[PDB]
Write a structure and sequence with these properties.
- The structure is cut from a larger assembly and holds one copy of chain A (about 110 residues) and two copies of chain B.
- Chain A is mostly beta strands and about 110 residues long.
- Chain A is built from one helix and seven strands, in the order βββββαββ.
- In chain A, a hairpin with a 4-residue loop joins β3 and β4.
- The longest helix of chain A has 7 residues, at about 55-65.
- The N and C termini of chain A lie far apart (about 30 Å).
- Chain B has about 130 residues and is mainly α.
- Chain B contains seven helices and no strands.
- Chain B has helices spanning about 1-10, 10-25, 30-35, 50-65, 75-85, 90-100, 110-120.
- In chain B, α5 crosses α6 (about 90-100).
- The longest helix of chain B is centred in the middle third of the chain and has 16 residues, at about 50-65.
- Classes of the chains: A mainly beta (about 110), B mainly alpha (about 130).
- Chains B and C meet through α3, α4 and α7 of B and loops of C.
- Chain C: It comes from Oryctolagus cuniculus.
Chain lengths: ~110, ~130, ~900
């Protein structure tokens, strides 16, 4: 269960395929509206190796749908997120997450 | 010296108010006359604070104090002590000549740093 | 629990000086349309997302002070219920975003067309993105105040306003009946782009602190004359009914004779050769006797105003003559002055003011009549569309037209005066246009408490830009922000508007300033003296004293302070740069005095008084109100009782009092799909919470309101009623109507206590206390009210993730007023089980110390930011419109309180 709303469309023809890493600037927020994670504060692109499941499932399968240069808003359910165990001291248990993902480039 | 001789002569003080009381000098309009021109009990008979010689000297005082340099401040209180020590004008002049070296330091006091720049900013000020 | 932190960007707003509104018999049109153009938008100049919103806002509560505020800060349009903004993807209202379907929805990209359509007759706010409709409309919103276009933007953006005519091309066809916004400009004011209400503007020699700004009102567009019907016409007036008409039958005709508009026997008036100086008998009879009874009508206005006549001197008829001048000579039936001639006659200022308001009451009747024939105002004249550039009230008219109206009736009253009949002024009644908002009048500025001085001699300047009601001096650190300076012992201030010194009252000192004057305040902590110097000259009291204030204790210390009344500008120079001072050399330098900021790197931090109501706990030392915590007995729930200390005594304070509890309750994230012993299985699973309030006997239920408030309620009104409650309904449908989403947003959800009282003939002091109960269900967002154990037809449904504070608004009418009972009904959990996480399964009522009553302060302190956004407003061109530019980024560190939802 994931919902993706476009904030600003990008290309729409180059989609993230297996073999090339995906380079993003995301901004994760809790459902109450309290930001918990971002990449622009660290001021470094978050390059994650798509297909190897090293990131959370919701982010992984929501990044596939959106294309290059697209600012997209996600909504990851706890099932596709950390769930009942949650993240210790960061994310409360059984929480729905929202991500302001932007894939500025594929490598 | 007009004020100094007034300070020295207790008698000139004594008939200073005698002329005031005999000729009914109000002493209050002479200070606020310009203020009342701008459409703005205790010492009614006479008061030392309303004396015209002291009021004139106080009003004219900032002009004289502009002529003193910021470094001269240390010399001011020393001469004040000698004057309290009952020393004549020749005595204080030669004491100042003896201790001219101990003048103020611009770098040693942050107050004097901006004061010196303000004092030297006058176009009528000469370094010598 | 723990305070959160984040880095956010400064957000500012820009509006054109255009105001519209609706009122009974108002001279304003009720449909308007404007557009904006996007030039450059950097998606991320900083870590935070770029902010850009366009919308309408209201003039009585949209005051987005820079820096912190509601939610996570950076507040702009739509962060409060006094604005309604659109960003390209959401409708912003009450700091809530709701997505909108659009044909190609996205955030505002460069070169996007945004069209705002406002209807005032029926509440509706419609947007269009690139001409395509936006499937969402605000409806059922309060109209009181004035609506204006406004844009809220972060750093690094460029936008352009399109207002129609010469101030926009609109790039599209507006829907019919929506007047272009360039027509709403008032005659006395030119079109310009201004920021919303500010406390600082940049100047040549330094920043200029600005006081409150006078705001125009919808009530100032209704022309309200004095009725001239119920006036029996007096004998002394019918006796002079003729000459005062004869002198105004061709007075407008006298000016243009012997010019290009010179009369001819073949034609008559209105034929570009108008005069016809002969007589009004030659002129048509209906307009003739109409002119007679218009002269009578002016005399009736004189009566209704309070003018009466008396005859003393020689009859002017004898000593008056008609002068056949070489000018105004005509061939049609002899030559004569076009009005009736008059000799040397003068007029006193009483007559000048009286003829001024006489012309006012002529203009306002004319405007009333035109409105009653449907006409309205437009800065460009449209006769077939029935709009005029002069359909504004006289006070808003232009000076040219004011003079043109006043000239004719000035001649008339002059002719009346010539006959010796007195023009009697009426009695004088002093009136104030606005009285309720006494707090939105002054704005106090002071240095930070860390700059407190307790020794030495200090000096600072205050260049009075304007000559209104402003004050400057010194103050103690604990100055109350909602008390006028000098009215208490906490300030030693000099009110130089009239030359007065203020400390625990008023008494004269010195002379009032003029424009461009500098008020250089002394202070001498060693001599315990305060001296005020104006333009380098020491001010003089009404005695021989050269020092304004004497024998002042050091105390906590003193802070340089100043304040400004409405429409005032002041330049405060604390002397950070010694050279920048002007009169320091003239006065202060030789006295041993020092600039207040002689050795300081950063500019001195100033704290201003923010006129935004906030909820603060009731002080334990408060003279009037006291809150008593009552222990819960075996049979009674714990209570938070309010009792008026000084009810009925002399100098008692009685006013509209707003109360809310300290901790809120939050509704669940996802709503659910589709004796007196509580059942254990029902009680451990129910999500319903109840509390009871007991209005005491002797306290009138007619001034009681009980319910809940969102954390953004800032409505401090002394005449509070349920009508003033802010509310708005968002309406959403598909591409072609078909409403599928209609929600209601409000910062205030209470009922009136007067609906729960029986309509008794007398004895409104109820022998039985009204016990209003309230219920909420977190799993459904539903709230209900109970009168005396029986439900009420009013009900409320709210969105999830909503924070609500238990609130009671009451006007005290008894010693014992209100009592919050933290009780419970059958199979219903208490509030102590609702607002505390570690008590979710405890049905026993509890009152932990963090739960305490708070009451609404009107004014509070705040801090002026050390830097502000650089906004460049200018007219790009006649075709381009008005451009707004902002480049430099500015970031602040916000401290967000979780429970109060404000940073």
């Amino acid at each position: 269960g994931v919902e993706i709303e476009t904030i600003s469309p990008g290309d729409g023809r180059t989609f993230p395929k297996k073999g090339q890493t995906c380079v993003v600037h995301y901004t994760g927020m809790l459902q109450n509206g309290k930001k918990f994670d971002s990449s622009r504060d660290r001021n470094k692109p978050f390059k994650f190796r798509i297909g190897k499941q090293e990131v959370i499932k919701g982010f992984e399968e929501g990044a596939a749908q959106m294309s290059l240069g697209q600012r997209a808003k996600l909504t990851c359910t706890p099932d596709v997120a950390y769930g009942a165990t949650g993240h210790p001291g960061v994310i409360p248990p059984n929480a729905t997450l929202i991500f302001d993902v932007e894939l500025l480039n594929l490598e | 010296e007009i004020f100094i001789y007034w300070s020295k002569s207790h008698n000139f003080k004594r008939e200073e108010q005698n002329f005031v009381v005999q000729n009914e000098i109000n002493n209050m309009s002479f200070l606020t006359a310009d203020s009342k021109s701008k459409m703005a009990r205790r010492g009614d008979r006479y008061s030392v604070q309303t004396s015209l010689i002291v009021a004139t000297l106080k009003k004219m005082l900032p002009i004289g104090l502009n002529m003193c340099a910021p470094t001269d401040q240390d010399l001011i209180m020393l001469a004040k002590t000698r004057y309290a020590l009952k020393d004549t004008d020749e005595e204080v002049r030669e004491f100042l000549q003896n201790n001219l070296h101990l003048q103020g330091k611009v770098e040693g006091s942050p107050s004097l740093r901006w004061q010196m720049a303000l004092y030297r900013g006058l176009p009528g000020r000469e370094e010598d | 629990l723990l305070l959160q932190t984040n880095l956010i960007n400064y957000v500012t707003s820009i509006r054109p000086n255009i105001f519209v509104g609706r009122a009974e018999g108002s001279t304003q049109y009720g449909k308007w349309y404007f557009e904006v153009m996007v030039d450059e938008v950097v998606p991320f100049l900083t870590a935070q997302a770029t902010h850009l919103r366009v919308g309408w806002a209201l003039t009585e509560g949209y005051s987005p002070y820079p820096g912190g505020g509601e939610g996570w800060g950076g507040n702009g349009v739509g962060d409060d219920l006094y604005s309604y903004g659109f960003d390209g993807l959401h409708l912003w209202t009450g700091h809530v975003a709701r997505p909108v379907t659009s044909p190609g929805q996205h955030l505002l990209a460069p070169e996007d067309v945004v069209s705002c359509c406002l209807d005032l007759s029926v509440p509706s706010i419609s947007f269009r993105i690139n001409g395509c409709p936006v499937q969402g409309v605000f409806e059922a919103f309060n109209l009181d105040g004035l609506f204006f276009p406004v844009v809220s933007f972060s750093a690094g953006v460029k936008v352009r306003f399109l207002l129609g005519g010469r101030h926009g091309e609109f790039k599209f066809l507006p829907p019919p009946g929506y007047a272009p916004c360039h027509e709403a400009v008032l005659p006395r004011e030119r079109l310009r782009l201004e920021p919303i209400k500010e406390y600082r503007r940049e100047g040549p020699r330094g920043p200029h602190l600005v006081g409150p700004s006078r705001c125009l009102s919808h009530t100032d567009f209704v022309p309200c004359p004095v009725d001239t019907v119920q006036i029996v016409l007096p004998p002394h007036l019918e006796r002079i009914r003729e000459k005062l008409a004869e002198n105004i039958h061709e007075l407008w005709a006298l000016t243009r004779i012997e010019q290009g508009w010179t009369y001819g026997p073949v034609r008559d008036d209105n034929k570009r050769l108008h005069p016809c100086l002969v007589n009004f008998h030659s002129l048509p009879e209906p307009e003739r006797n109409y002119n007679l009874q218009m002269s009578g009508e002016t005399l009736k206005t004189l009566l209704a105003l309070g003018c009466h006549v008396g005859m003393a001197d020689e009859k002017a008829e004898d000593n008056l003559k008609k002068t056949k001048l070489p000018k105004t000579y005509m061939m049609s039936n002899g030559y004569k002055p076009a009005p009736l001639d008059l000799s040397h006659v003068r007029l006193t200022p009483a007559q000048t003011t009286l003829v001024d308001r006489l012309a006012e009451n002529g203009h306002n009747v004319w405007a009333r009549d035109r409105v009653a024939q449907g006409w309205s105002y437009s800065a460009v004249q449209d006769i077939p569309a029935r709009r005029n550039p002069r359909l504004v009230p006289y006070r808003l008219l232009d000076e040219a037209t004011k003079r043109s109206n006043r000239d004719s009736l000035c001649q008339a009253v002059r002719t009346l005066l010539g006959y010796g009949y007195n023009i009697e002024p009426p009695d004088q009644e002093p009136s104030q246009v606005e009285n309720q908002s006494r707090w939105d009048r002054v704005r106090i500025f002071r240095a930070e408490k860390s700059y407190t001085v307790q020794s030495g001699r200090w000096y600072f300047e205050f260049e009075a830009v304007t000559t209104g009601e402003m004050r400057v001096g010194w103050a103690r650190p604990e100055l109350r922000p909602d008390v006028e300076l000098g009215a208490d012992e906490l300030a030693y201030v000099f009110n130089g508007h009239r030359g007065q010194r203020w400390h625990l009252g008023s008494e004269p000192f010195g002379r009032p300033w003029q424009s461009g004057d500098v008020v250089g305040c002394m202070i001498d902590l060693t001599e315990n003296t305060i001296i005020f110097t104006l333009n380098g000259e020491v001010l003089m009291s009404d005695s021989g004293s050269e020092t304004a204030f004497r024998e002042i204790e050091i105390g906590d210390g003193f802070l340089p302070v100043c304040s400004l009344g409405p429409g005032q500008v002041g330049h405060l120079n604390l002397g950070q740069d010694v050279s920048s001072l002007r009169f320091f050399a003239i006065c202060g330098l030789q006295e041993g005095f020092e600039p207040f900021a002689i050795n300081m790197q950063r500019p001195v931090t100033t704290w201003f008084s923010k006129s935004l109501p906030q909820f603060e706990p009731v002080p334990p030392e408060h003279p009037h109100y006291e809150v008593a915590r009552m222990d819960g007995t075996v049979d009674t729930p714990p209570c938070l009782r309010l009792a008026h200390r000084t009810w009925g005594s002399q100098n008692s304070l009685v006013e509209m009092l707003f109360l809310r509890l300290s901790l809120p309750v939050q509704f669940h994230q996802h709503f659910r799909c589709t004796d007196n012993r509580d059942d254990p299985e029902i009680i451990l699973n129910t999500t319903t919470y109840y509390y009871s309030v007991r209005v005491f006997a002797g306290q009138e239920p007619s001034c009681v309101w009980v319910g809940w408030v969102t954390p953004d309620y800032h409505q401090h009104d002394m005449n509070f009623d349920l009508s003033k409650v802010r509310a708005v309904t968002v309406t959403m449908g598909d591409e072609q109507g078909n409403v599928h989403s209609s929600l209601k947003c409000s910062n205030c959800y209470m009922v009136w206590g007067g609906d729960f009282v029986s309509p008794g003939q007398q004895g409104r002091i109820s022998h039985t206390d009204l016990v209003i109960g309230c219920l909420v269900d977190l799993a459904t967002g539903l709230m209900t009210f109970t009168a005396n154990g029986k439900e009420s037809n009013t009900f409320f449904q709210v969105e999830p993730n909503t924070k609500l504070f238990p609130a009671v608004f009451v006007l005290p009418t008894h010693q014992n007023v209100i009592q919050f009972e933290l009780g419970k009904q059958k199979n219903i959990m208490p509030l102590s089980a609702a607002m505390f996480l570690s008590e979710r399964k405890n049905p026993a009522p509890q009152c932990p110390p963090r739960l305490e009553v708070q009451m609404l302060m009107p004014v509070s302190w705040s801090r002026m930011p050390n830097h502000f956004l650089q906004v460049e407003t200018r007219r790009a061109g006649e075709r381009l419109g008005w451009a707004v530019q902002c480049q430099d980024p500015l970031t602040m560190m916000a401290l967000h309180i979780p429970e109060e939802n404000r940073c």
